[PDB]
Amino acid sequence: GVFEPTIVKVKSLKFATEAAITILRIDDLIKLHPE
């Protein structure tokens, strides 16, 4: 009797992949000093 809605696992796949892409494409950080 262990069940879960299918929209939970479908959405979590799409959100976890798009967030990994945007972090992966970064090859430089410039941090500006506060004023």
Partner: protein, 41 residues
Amino acid sequence: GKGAYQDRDKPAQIRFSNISAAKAVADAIRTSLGPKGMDKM
């Protein structure tokens, strides 16, 4: 002929300081160019 002595070194050292400043900016954004260039944050 050996005339036209150049007794001031300020224009020479300034023209060379503009080259190194501009060449350094072009080297910074060389990586992000083309279909396989990455992103800066």
